[PDB]
Paper text:
We have built upon this literature and produced an mPlum-tagged Fe-protein, wherein the maturation of the mPlum chromophore can be used as a visual marker of oxygen exposure. This strain is able to grow robustly under nitrogen-limiting conditions, demonstrating that the construct is active and able to reduce atmospheric dinitrogen. Thus, within these cells and upon successful anaerobic purification, the mPlum chromophore remains immature due to a low cytoplasmic concentration of molecular oxygen. In consequence, the protein sample will visibly turn purple. This construct allows for visualization and quantification of oxygen exposure throughout the purification and all subsequent manipulations of the protein. We developed protocols for use of this setup in the reproducible determination of high-resolution structures of both the nitrogenase Fe-protein and MoFe-protein and of the MoFe-protein:Fe-protein complex by single particle cryoEM.
The Fe- and MoFe-proteins are both inactivated upon exposure to oxygen, with the Fe-protein being the more sensitive of the two4.
Author numbering:
A (entry chain A), B (entry chain B): 2 to 116, 119 to 274
Write the structure that this text describes.
């Protein structure tokens, strides 16, 4: 079993890319589990064809504690047999995202859900703090893949996630597997992300293009793999899945300074 | 002295709106202090004409601890006498973003920097956790203004911040003074934000349009008030400032559910 975490800032289609990648993995015969560690809890909608999956936090609140919770309600099987579970966001203004994530992971481990080829933690990378770095810090995810784009905020979040990895890459076995470039139809975006990965010492594992079929499948609460298996974007997600399966470059990144990031953006025509 | 917090998700120009509002306030004769509570620390650049102001956490690290710091290096005066502080983001992957704010506010209180007509805490509202809600929880900010837009994520963040205000309003005195609509050139965006404010039990205090002069001023690292005083956007920021000064409608919000927000987006042609 491989423990991978997809990190990245919100609003760039990270969850859709994660779900389509997991669907492509399931289509290859891999038993994949998705754990959504996002407060929005949108990391399992496409696999489950659901408007909203009941997160562990909400069901614990309805049942008092996670101790009186059942894995059958917590964990749901979606397309391709993919198991789906939502950690649940913090209480707005009160709790930590990290406490919800660790509670979900501990409940899953106690219930025996992990006993699978891949476990993907879809973790928010908008802010890189102790709470959102729980999978990295508690040795829950060993391979970190960052979904980014050719915009200042996306690469800044990627660099901060790399800083967190570097913090926990010593006295720990968590490594950066690569960068997934979610295209935003920006010119020289793939080249910019390749250069950013080279600066970080990692690779751009795959460049995910923008396609209308992604939104067409998302209207149906479905992945591109399930919706149109013969689409070109399905082949892109299959290539990403194969490159993640065959990924051997797991490195401790070298985070860049702010000036280097601005220089990269100037070089590739963003600012 | 009025203690206010500008909350809101990132990527919608909340920081620029806050800095222009503070510049318009100082242009009317009010003594304002900006406390930047975002980890990326861009809340005081346009006032100070700086690429990036040195944050409290950085100086604490360079000087060993906060107790070896001086207000001269921490507190900087920019355009119109506005006093600028950056709280300092957490160490990526380790610290909590809300304890840097605790440290900054405590240090400013010991240094006597709070004894001023307005204090504005620019607080990021991407994730509404116990850390990022420190000014609301610790009773440091009494009036909350949420900068939002017609996009789904901005309205979701506004609803979550309203939930936090509700949690801390039945025990403290923190209230929501209105919603600031940061236009994204979306059709029926002002009407949608007005409807959201009416559902929350509050008001859309001002509609901030999109203007190129905002970007022209930001390139020069200054606000529109200082760059082009005779511009229309400067007048919009002045209207927002005088509506903030004259604001008396401070309410405990009524946060709306997922279905209500989705139906609001459906009504005005966004979903
Ligand atoms: S550690 Fe991060 S998620 Fe947890 S309360 Fe602090 S800022 Fe919020």
């Amino acid at each position: 079993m491989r423990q991978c975490a997809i990190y990245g800032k919100g609003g760039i289609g990270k969850s859709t890319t994660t779900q389509n990648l997991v669907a492509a993995l399931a289509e290859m015969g891999k038993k994949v589990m998705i754990v959504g560690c996002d407060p929005k809890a949108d990391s399992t909608r496409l696999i489950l064809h659901s408007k909203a999956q009941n997160t562990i936090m909400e069901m614990a609140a309805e049942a008092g504690t996670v101790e009186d919770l059942e894995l059958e309600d917590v964990l749901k099987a979606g397309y391709g047999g993919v198991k789906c579970v939502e950690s649940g966001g913090p209480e707005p203004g009160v709790g930590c995202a990290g406490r919800g994530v660790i509670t979900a992971i501990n409940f899953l481990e106690e219930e025996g859900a992990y006993e699978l080829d891949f476990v993907f933690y879809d973790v928010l990378g908008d802010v890189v703090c102790g709470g959102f770095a729980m999978p990295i810090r508690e040795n829950k995810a060993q391979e970190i893949y960052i979904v980014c784009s050719g915009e200042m905020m996306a690469m800044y979040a990627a660099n901060n996630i790399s800083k967190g990895i570097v913090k926990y890459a010593n006295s720990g076995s968590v490594r950066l597997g690569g960068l997934i470039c979610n295209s935003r139809n920006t010119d020289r975006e793939d080249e910019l992300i390749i250069a950013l990965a080279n600066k970080l010492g990692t690779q751009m594992i795959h460049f995910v293009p923008r396609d209308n079929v992604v939104q067409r499948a998302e209207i149906r609460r479905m992945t591109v793999i399930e919706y149109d298996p013969k689409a070109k974007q399905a082949d892109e997600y299959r290539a990403l899945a194969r490159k993640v399966v065959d990924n051997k470059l797991l490195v401790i990144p070298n985070p860049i300074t702010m000036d280097e990031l601005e220089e990269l953006l100037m070089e590739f025509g963003i600012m």
